[PDB]
Motif scaffolding. Structure first.
Motif, short mmCIF file in Angstrom:
data_model
loop_
_atom_site.label_atom_id
_atom_site.label_comp_id
_atom_site.label_asym_id
_atom_site.label_seq_id
_atom_site.Cartn_x
_atom_site.Cartn_y
_atom_site.Cartn_z
N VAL C 51 0.47 3.97 -12.70
CA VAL C 51 1.90 3.63 -12.49
C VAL C 51 2.67 4.87 -12.03
CG1 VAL C 51 4.04 2.96 -13.71
CG2 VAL C 51 1.87 1.66 -14.06
N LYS C 54 1.70 5.99 -8.46
CA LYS C 54 2.00 4.97 -7.44
C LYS C 54 3.50 5.02 -7.15
CE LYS C 54 0.94 0.39 -5.83
NZ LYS C 54 2.00 0.42 -4.79
N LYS C 126 -11.41 2.81 -7.12
CA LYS C 126 -10.33 2.14 -6.37
C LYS C 126 -9.18 3.14 -6.13
CE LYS C 126 -6.62 -1.19 -7.12
NZ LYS C 126 -5.74 0.00 -7.37
N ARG C 133 -6.44 6.24 1.43
CA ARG C 133 -5.73 5.31 2.31
C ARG C 133 -4.31 5.84 2.60
NH1 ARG C 133 -2.79 0.59 0.89
NH2 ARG C 133 -3.89 0.54 -1.11
N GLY C 174 -7.75 -6.69 -7.85
CA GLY C 174 -6.85 -5.72 -7.18
C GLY C 174 -7.59 -4.75 -6.27
N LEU C 177 -8.11 -6.90 -3.13
CA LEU C 177 -6.80 -6.91 -2.45
C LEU C 177 -6.59 -5.60 -1.67
CD1 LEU C 177 -4.02 -8.23 -1.89
CD2 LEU C 177 -3.23 -7.26 -4.03
N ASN C 178 -6.71 -4.47 -2.34
CA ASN C 178 -6.44 -3.18 -1.65
C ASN C 178 -7.46 -2.90 -0.54
OD1 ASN C 178 -4.37 -3.14 -3.45
ND2 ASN C 178 -4.71 -1.04 -4.13
N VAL C 181 -6.38 -4.82 2.43
CA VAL C 181 -5.26 -4.08 3.08
C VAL C 181 -5.78 -2.89 3.89
CG1 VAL C 181 -3.19 -2.69 2.70
CG2 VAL C 181 -3.52 -4.84 1.40
N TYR C 184 -7.13 -4.32 7.19
CA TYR C 184 -6.08 -4.86 8.09
C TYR C 184 -5.20 -3.72 8.65
CZ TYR C 184 -2.76 -8.10 10.08
OH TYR C 184 -1.92 -8.83 10.92
N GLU C 185 -4.73 -2.83 7.78
CA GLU C 185 -3.64 -1.89 8.08
C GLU C 185 -4.20 -0.56 8.58
OE1 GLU C 185 -0.49 -2.64 8.29
OE2 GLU C 185 -0.27 -4.46 7.07
N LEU C 225 -1.11 -12.80 -4.39
CA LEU C 225 -0.94 -11.74 -3.36
C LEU C 225 -2.00 -11.84 -2.25
CD1 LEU C 225 -0.13 -8.84 -5.78
CD2 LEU C 225 1.47 -10.46 -4.80
N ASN C 229 -0.91 -12.45 1.67
CA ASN C 229 -1.45 -11.68 2.82
C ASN C 229 -2.13 -12.67 3.79
OD1 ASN C 229 -0.50 -9.19 2.02
ND2 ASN C 229 -2.45 -8.57 1.04
N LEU C 232 0.49 -14.15 5.91
CA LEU C 232 1.00 -13.11 6.83
C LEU C 232 0.00 -12.95 7.99
CD1 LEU C 232 3.18 -10.93 7.29
CD2 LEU C 232 1.69 -9.37 6.03
N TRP C 233 -1.31 -12.97 7.73
CA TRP C 233 -2.36 -12.52 8.69
C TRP C 233 -2.81 -13.64 9.62
CZ3 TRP C 233 -5.84 -9.86 4.49
CH2 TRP C 233 -5.23 -8.66 4.11
#
Ligand SMILES: [Cl-]
Ligand SMILES: [Cl-]
Ligand SMILES: [Mg+2]
Ligand SMILES: [Mg+2]
Ligand SMILES: [Mg+2]
Ligand SMILES: [Mg+2]
Ligand SMILES: [Mg+2]
Ligand SMILES: [Mg+2]
Lengths: 9, 234, 234, 9
Positions: C51, C54, C126, C133, C174, C177-178, C181, C184-185, C225, C229, C232-233
């Motif tokens: 936390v 981040k 992670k 990243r 998670g 998920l990351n 990302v 994609y990004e 989430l 995404n 969105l994608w």
């Protein structure tokens, strides 16, 4: 609760 | 100073970039550098200085209030947890006091003594009142002398503003708003707070007819805050 | 280190106070101090470390994006304004890189090598993927080697998570998920991103029947989430 | 605009 003072512009 | 090698214009440009980036500690450092070049500030530059430090001290005040509330709960049934809450509240408190002392030091060396026009002099004296008020919020030891320093700065600003500015001037309005907050929140004088807010609001209402559409919007935004405090206080 | 004299328990207590006060730079410094005591972290302590950093890097990324957008506009009809936008974007970029290097250094000295349980090892790998990243987002020079470091960390985490954790485990979710990302990004692999998100979502859906009400809530929050995404994608 | 990554709990 608390009084408002002058904000940023 | 770490900003001593940067051009004044470059410091002002970077303060505006830091505001857009919501980097208010950087913005304050750039504006402190600009003040220390020793030239007077324009109206826009005074506003940048005020925005930067209000945002930095605003985060500190919000954090201090959270920590003070936890510390007060601990001093009630409450399980002993050691010195850590007090130590951490003290750390935030000391950093807040440092930020206030830095702003007061800029005003004393030498923004106020070079400020001759009513708009600049009232702006700087209101700021002096404000940063003594933020010191007063955390004071428990010279609490009286800090409250008197705030009152004296606000009163000198009020006397110039009433002589030199129309009752709708936004600087004059925001000074009266903040002095009313001093009276209510610091000086244990709610009746003085209510009287000042009401008289300020009514004298401004009577002068709105003189204003352009854009000046009208500037003045009425601040008048609404006087009315919001009067609703809270009564 | 400035936290070398403070008890480990006191650093963890003060990290929790800093979180309540929204003082995330303080929270990160307390948690770095706690890591440097050399003991392994509990699940709750790993979450505090995550936390804190981040939130700190999140402010830096948001500021960097604002400054990079202004800098890109300036390099289009655009009036020359000097070196200040680039200099200030570089200052924020260097501070962001420093925060990432600090987190990577904690993971390498010595959180990952002492992490033997799947939950701790997947959490730390992670995190290693995440902070490479964030380095990749601002890289323009070793951009390839930084992207490979992120991919390699995420892939090692994925291989452990698929062997050792159920498809609904929130850490496993998670991580996927990351990594999606990342694809994609960062890695110019939208089809890999979509495939991973869809397979992760469907395998989790099929295992929800095994969960308590509270575990169900934890897993479905992350699955939403993945679905956001995918919307969105596609 | 940008993809959502894992948030804080
Ligand atoms: Cl402390
Ligand atoms: Cl800079
Ligand atoms: Mg010069
Ligand atoms: Mg008890
Ligand atoms: Mg103190
Ligand atoms: Mg010890
Ligand atoms: Mg032109
Ligand atoms: Mg660079």
């Amino acid at each position: 609760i608390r009084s408002t003072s002058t904000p940023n512009v | 100073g770490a900003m001593g090698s940067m051009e004044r214009a470059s410091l002002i440009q970077k303060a505006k970039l830091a505001e857009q980036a919501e980097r208010y500690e950087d913005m304050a450092a750039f504006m402190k550098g600009a003040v220390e070049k020793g030239e007077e500030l324009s109206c826009e530059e005074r506003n940048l200085l005020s925005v930067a430090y209000k945002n930095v001290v605003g985060g500190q005040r919000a954090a201090w209030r959270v920590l003070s509330s936890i510390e007060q709960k601990s001093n009630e049934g409450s399980e002993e947890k050691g010195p850590e809450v007090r130590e951490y509240r003290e750390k935030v408190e000391t950093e807040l006091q440092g930020v206030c002392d830095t702003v007061l030091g800029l005003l004393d060396s030498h923004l106020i003594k070079e400020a001759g026009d009513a708009e600049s002099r009232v702006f700087y004296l209101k700021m002096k009142g404000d940063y003594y008020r933020y010191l007063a919020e955390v004071a428990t030891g010279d609490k009286k002398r800090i409250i008197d320093s705030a009152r004296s700065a606000y009163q000198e600003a009020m006397d110039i503003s009433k002589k030199e500015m129309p009752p709708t001037n936004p600087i004059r309005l925001g000074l009266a708003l903040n002095f009313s907050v001093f009276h209510y929140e610091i000086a244990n004088s709610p009746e003085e707070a209510i009287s000042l807010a009401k008289t300020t609001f009514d004298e401004a209402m009577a002068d709105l007819h003189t204003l352009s559409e854009d000046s009208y919007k500037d003045s009425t935004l601040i008048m609404q805050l006087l009315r919001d405090n009067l609703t809270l206080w009564t």
